[PDB]
Amino acid sequence: QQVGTSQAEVHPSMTWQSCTAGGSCTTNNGKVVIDANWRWVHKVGDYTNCYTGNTWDTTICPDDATCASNCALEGANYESTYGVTASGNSLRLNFVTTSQQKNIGSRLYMMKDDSTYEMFKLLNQEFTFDVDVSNLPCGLNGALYFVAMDADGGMSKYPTNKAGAKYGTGYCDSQCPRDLKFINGQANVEGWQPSSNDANAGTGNHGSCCAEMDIWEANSISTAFTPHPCDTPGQVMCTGDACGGTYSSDRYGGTCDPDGCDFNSFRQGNKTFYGPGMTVDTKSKFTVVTQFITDDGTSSGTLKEIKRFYVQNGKVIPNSESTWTGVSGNSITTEYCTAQKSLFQDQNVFEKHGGLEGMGAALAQGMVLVMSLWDDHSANMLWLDSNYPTTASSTTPGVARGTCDISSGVPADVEANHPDAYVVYSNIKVGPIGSTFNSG
Ligand SMILES: *[C@@H]1O[C@H](CO)[C@@H](O)[C@H](O)[C@H]1NC(C)=O
Ligand SMILES: [Zn+2]
Ligand SMILES: [Zn+2]
Numbered sequence: 024q025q026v027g028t029s030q031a032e033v034h035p036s037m038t039w040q041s042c043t044a045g046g047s048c049t050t051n052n053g054k055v056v057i058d059a060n061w062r063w064v065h066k067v068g069d070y071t072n073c074y075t076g077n078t079w080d081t082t083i084c085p086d087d088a089t090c091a092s093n094c095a096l097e098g099a100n101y102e103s104t105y106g107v108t109a110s111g112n113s114l115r116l117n118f119v120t121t122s123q124q125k126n127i128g129s130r131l132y133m134m135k136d137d138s139t140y141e142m143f144k145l146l147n148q149e150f151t152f153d154v155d156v157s158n159l160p161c162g163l164n165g166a167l168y169f170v171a172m173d174a175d176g177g178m179s180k181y182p183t184n185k186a187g188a189k190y191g192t193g194y195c196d197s198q199c200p201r202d203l204k205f206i207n208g209q210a211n212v213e214g215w216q217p218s219s220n221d222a223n224a225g226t227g228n229h230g231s232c233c234a235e236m237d238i239w240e241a242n243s244i245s246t247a248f249t250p251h252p253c254d255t256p257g258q259v260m261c262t263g264d265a266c267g268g269t270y271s272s273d274r275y276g277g278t279c280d281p282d283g284c285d286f287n288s289f290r291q292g293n294k295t296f297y298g299p300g301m302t303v304d305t306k307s308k309f310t311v312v313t314q315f316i317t318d319d320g321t322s323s324g325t326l327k328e329i330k331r332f333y334v335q336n337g338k339v340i341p342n343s344e345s346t347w348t349g350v351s352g353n354s355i356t357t358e359y360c361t362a363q364k365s366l367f368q369d370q371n372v373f374e375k376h377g378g379l380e381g382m383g384a385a386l387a388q389g390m391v392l393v394m395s396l397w398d399d400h401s402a403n404m405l406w407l408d409s410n411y412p413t414t415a416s417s418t419t420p421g422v423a424r425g426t427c428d429i430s431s432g433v434p435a436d437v438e439a440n441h442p443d444a445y446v447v448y449s450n451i452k453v454g455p456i457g458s459t460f461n462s463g
Pocket of ligand 3: 127398399400434438
């Protein structure tokens with residue numbers, strides 16, 4: 024896609040810190056950028072939309088290549104259009120924002136400069152941040168995660184992408200999403216079908232696959248952390264139902280793990296660890312620490328464990344024990360993942376696509392930091408905070424993931440009832456293991 028000039032693009036500033044062993048930290052002058060799919064996209068030299076609602080203008084966009092030549096991405100009004108504000112080290116995302124139109128959610132990337140994403144290298148490090156999830160109900164997800172995107176959003180690779188990381192291009196994840204309008208400097212107009220329950224979304228013939236480390240998928244009820252390996256760690260375009268993932272008919276038939284190896288304390292058998300009034304109390308802000316432990320204690324070792332700590336009211340809180348017979352420990356390891364998928368009777372494509380070693384291979388490439396807020400038009404967020412699948416018995420291991428009602432989270436309802444919902448991410452720190460909090 025091309026660059027529109029009607030609205031200048033100015034990235035809100037957000038600082039984060041780099042820490043050294045011993046706990047000293049240096050402040051980095053980061054900036055954030057909204058993902059290209061949220062943007063106005065119009066004919067070059069005109070105001071005519073290339074895409075409106077959930078359908079393309081097939082005169083401007085008769086095929087994927089012509090569409091990319093003829094269609095320009097615009098700059099964003101972060102606060103007024105998108106409900107996005109930042110100050111100091113804090114980023115706030117609001118759910119619904121009404122201007123001339125009604126915007127729902129957002130997805131932001133951390134930038135190193137105005138044309139380059141910050142490439143985090145997490146092996147043998149910890150990532151730590153503070154969050155306020157107190158205004159997130161059932162059905163919403165404030166996600167903070169990492170994906171193996173290209174640092175320039177694909178500009179050097181794809182000359183027909185003139186916009187790049189400045190306009191939030193190049194997204195990919197472990198669902199191999201087919202709902203993206205531009206992938207690899209081509210539109211996705213070919214094969215495009217509108218969503219049956221999302222007035223703003225649809226899916227095309229192309230998807231964008233890469234490995235994904237879900238540090239944080241959460242609301243006030245439940246949270247989960249989840250590595251998703253792929254056969255290739257970096258961005259790849261896929262075609263058709265062969266993509267696999269949530270957007271295709273056979274979830275498990277592609278090159279990425281769409282389920283991941285998850286640790287949700289509630290799902291792992293402790294109903295009183297995370298939530299309102301719980302050990303980790305969602306009514307207030309708390310710190311989330313995530314460690315990526317390697318086999319040899321260096322950044323070139325193989326990923327072997329993912330550990331989680333929380334800090335709240337100055338108390339360091341280790342992750343809760345998994346309580347199911349045969350599925351113990353409080354971290355993600357290969358042995359956990361094998362044992363968990365077996366007990367829960369889930370298909371283990373985690374191992375098939377490389378397990379933790381494959382996730383570590385993605386981490387070694389460098390990864391982009393994503394902060395988002397969304398509702399779930401495929402599964403109503405029930406997989407995070409309710410029984411899933413909703414037909415199953417809540418006494419079966421793996422079924423119950425939080426206390427939300429099985430009828431919660433319908434997007435029409437979520438959009439109507441919680442337009443005011445918001446999340447606040449702040450105080451990001453990255454450094455050697457133990458360096459970012461009162462360890463260990
Ligand atoms: C839940 O986790 C907390 C903190 O680790 C612990 O004190 C409590 O006993 C746990 N509950 C169960 C059922 O294991
Ligand atoms: Zn016009
Ligand atoms: Zn929605």
